[PDB]
């Protein structure tokens, strides 16, 4: 009957839909690779979809995916075993080398832009007339690391203009230079900003930005990766 036909048809449709969805989700990261970067023998039963192209605004070009995949950066790790499936040990300082949970991606070394082609993220001092509108204003507070030592002081908030949100704290260090700290990685308290991810001696090593009034997607990735990496890699200097 018609109900039998509807249900049978539905399941055929659903298999087709899942096939479509899975292949759509293979537009990044495939083909699969061996641990040495060569194509893996087993790519699985889903083939790559035909390429699609995104037109990017403001003259930034296009993105076509799937496309040739490459890390576009050195990866300072080495095998710890003679066969596949084991961890890869940092060959240097993993925080400095940007691997493991300190990883960054070689994103475009330009700032994200808003719908009007202006820098999406700006220091609040340069954003007319953005201001703190609620909660404890962190500007001026000392910044404490997981070693319970003061690493610096907050000198600004970097704000997302179109979305009206705090994105980073700008922190001045002992030498007068500043670093950006992801808002999601700080705790604003009454008398301080607390950073559990980093001990005070690691603040100097936070990746710096090239221009003092903008931050590129590449620089954001290196900053955020480094700070998050401290959770694992500063665990020795933390501290109940």
């Amino acid at each position: 009957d018609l109900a039998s036909l509807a249900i049978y048809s539905f399941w055929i449709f659903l298999a087709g839909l899942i096939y479509y969805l899975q292949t759509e989700n293979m537009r990044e990261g495939y083909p699969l690779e061996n641990e040495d970067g060569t194509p893996a023998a087993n790519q699985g039963p889903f083939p790559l979809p035909k390429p699609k192209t995104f037109i990017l605004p403001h003259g930034r070009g296009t993105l076509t995916v799937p496309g040739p995949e490459s890390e576009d950066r050195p990866i300072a790790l080495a095998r710890t075993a003679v066969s596949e499936g084991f961890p890869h040990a940092p060959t240097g300082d993993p925080m400095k080398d940007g691997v493991g949970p300190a990883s960054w991606v070689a994103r475009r070394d330009l700032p994200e832009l808003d719908g009007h082609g202006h820098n999406k993220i700006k220091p609040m001092k340069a954003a007319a007339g953005f201001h703190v509108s609620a909660g404890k204003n962190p500007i001026g507070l000392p910044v404490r690391g997981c070693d319970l030592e003061i690493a610096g002081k907050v000198v600004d908030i970097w704000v997302d203009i179109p979305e009206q949100m705090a994105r980073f704290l700008e922190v001045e260090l002992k030498d007068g230079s500043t670093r950006l700290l992801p808002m999601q990685m700080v705790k604003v308290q009454s008398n301080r900003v607390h950073v559990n991810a980093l001990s005070s001696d690691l603040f100097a090593g936070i990746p710096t930005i090239k221009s003092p009034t903008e931050v590129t997607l590449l620089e954001e990735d290196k900053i955020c990766g480094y700070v998050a990496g401290g959770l694992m890699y500063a665990a020795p200097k933390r501290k109940s």
Binding site: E28, S70, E84, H88, G100, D114, G115
Partner: protein, 281 residues
Amino acid sequence: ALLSFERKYRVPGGTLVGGNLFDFWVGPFYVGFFGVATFFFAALGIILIAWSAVLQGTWNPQLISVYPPALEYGLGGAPLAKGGLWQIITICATGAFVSWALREVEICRKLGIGYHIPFAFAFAILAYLTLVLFRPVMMGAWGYAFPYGIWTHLDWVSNTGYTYGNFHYNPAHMIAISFFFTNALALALHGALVLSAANPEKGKEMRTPDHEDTFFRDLVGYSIGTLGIHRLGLLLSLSAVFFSALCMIITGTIWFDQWVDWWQWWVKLPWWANIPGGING
């Protein structure tokens, strides 16, 4: 076996138990101590279900059903073929689910990400435990729990609901449902909004989050924003499940009559209880 960008994240560390002993992968899957635990619990559970099937005398997936001890057993043990298998399978399930969550925690630690995912999953586990553990304990028997069978679990839902009349009248159930419906609504809108921006009219440049805010302000006069929507989806789905667990934990314990009659407290308020007219006068 690796995504193109995957190797740089496959470093040692993040384990909760065992140090480096189980710090490895099998194909895409991370293992860890809790991967081993999940495998053990799941394996035992599945073997015991297969044994329950043999004792039931069927291999049909639509027929296999593992029932909890009858009510006469109260909260005691029961012979294997008479509820004991359900009891052991339930310990296995619980072990497998909790192990799965803890393995998710180890994966978060290795990846340097927040713990939101296993935290969220723990709500599902707590709802499962409400039905198989907390509620039966409060009611005084394992037999109030649901059986493990594709259709028999549905018989349990129907029988349990109609024990209290139309279960629609459970007010915690009304809230739970509102969160489920609102969640699906928000999921549809989130999926649609992102895709409508990423895949604009033919030949046009990708839209921005400014356009997403704009679209929604144009439409309803408000946009929650890109952070807000992910906060929202999380809150709606966890609230739905929290009120689900709540709606069941109070049923058969603090409220055990017909849920429809609960609503009389409002109608019977002294100020209007006795005014004629309307539906209830």
